[PDB]
Amino acid sequence: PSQFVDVDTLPSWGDSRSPFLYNKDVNGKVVLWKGDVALLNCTAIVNTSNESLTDKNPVSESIFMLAGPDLKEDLQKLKGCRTGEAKLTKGFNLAARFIIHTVGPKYKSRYRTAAESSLYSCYRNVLQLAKEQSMSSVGFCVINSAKRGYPLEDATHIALRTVRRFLEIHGETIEKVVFAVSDLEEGTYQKLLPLYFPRSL
């Protein structure tokens, strides 16, 4: 039997007071899934890391384990990744063709505008890469790691708003965006999805 999670089997948000208008087409591309992003057969899955690409966190731990050691050669070639930027590697043993590696900000209240700008750039640059590579699906992890301390609800507004706006303009080439969540984040995503992706008219 297969060792991965098929994005085709996952129910879409379009199956289940905001400024955003109902948009059936965009809603059909969004998926909320509680599970380990590393299992997904999306074109690319997203790894969240530090500037040296050596961060130990639950997302990276699964991804590195499932990709295997051939990843380390690809990874050194990159020579880090700056806060807010995204970088492509092959997926090696992962079900996904690519990994997009990115680095969220270490959140500090005194740098709140900078943290917002950096997190926004993470999501924007992942999506930029996906468009550039003509990818049909992207599996997002929660880019804000618990250890970097971004307030979860604020972070989730940025994630959903950015994907909404990108899908409105550049959606046609993309079939699915999956927000892979753990129990920690699911409720907040469930809470906010209706605001960025209203279901009724």
Side-chain angles (χ1 to χ4, degrees), residues 42-44 46 100 126-127 130 135-140 174 176-178:
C42 296
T43 313
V46 178
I100 298 166
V126 167
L127 292 166
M135 306 189 185
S136 68
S137 61
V138 181
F140 282 97
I174 297 194
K176 293 296 159 69
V177 172
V178 180

Side-chain angles (χ1 to χ4, degrees), residues 135-184:
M135 306 189 185
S136 68
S137 61
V138 181
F140 282 97
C141 63
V142 176
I143 290 174
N144 47 297
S145 57
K147 67 198 300 219
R148 268 173 188 237
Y150 208 120
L152 174 61
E153 192 142 343
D154 291 332
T156 305
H157 282 280
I158 296 168
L160 300 179
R161 185 176 70 216
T162 307
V163 168
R164 167 66 194 232
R165 293 177 172 163
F166 172 94
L167 283 173
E168 272 173 1
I169 288 74
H170 308 275
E172 276 219 49
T173 175
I174 297 194
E175 297 176 357
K176 293 296 159 69
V177 172
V178 180
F179 297 107
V181 297
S182 68
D183 288 300
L184 181 59

Side-chain angles (χ1 to χ4, degrees), residues 15 18-55 57-71 73-76 78 80-81 83-89 91-111 113-128:
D15 302 326
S18 97
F20 290 90
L21 312 174
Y22 174 75
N23 177 335
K24 173 160 205 183
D25 175 77
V26 169
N27 286 8
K29 302 176 173 201
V30 170
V31 179
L32 178 63
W33 176 66
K34 183 155 73 65
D36 188 339
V37 77
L39 297 175
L40 292 169
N41 69 339
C42 296
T43 313
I45 62 144
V46 178
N47 180 38
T48 194
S49 200
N50 60 8
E51 300 73 358
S52 53
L53 298 180
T54 63
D55 196 51
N57 71 67
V59 166
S60 292
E61 284 181 69
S62 309
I63 292 183
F64 288 169
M65 169 169 286
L66 293 178
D70 292 0
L71 177 54
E73 282 80 66
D74 252 33
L75 220 43
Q76 303 317 42
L78 302 178
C81 182
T83 316
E85 82 167 308
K87 290 190 167 180
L88 193 77
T89 64
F92 301 102
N93 188 54
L94 292 176
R97 181 187 293 152
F98 301 115
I99 300 160
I100 298 166
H101 306 268
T102 196
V103 176
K106 295 169 154 163
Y107 183 88
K108 292 174 167 141
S109 292
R110 63 178 192 286
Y111 301 151
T113 299
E116 290 169 349
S117 171
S118 286
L119 190 63
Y120 167 66
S121 291
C122 291
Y123 281 89
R124 178 263 195 189
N125 286 321
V126 167
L127 292 166
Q128 179 169 355

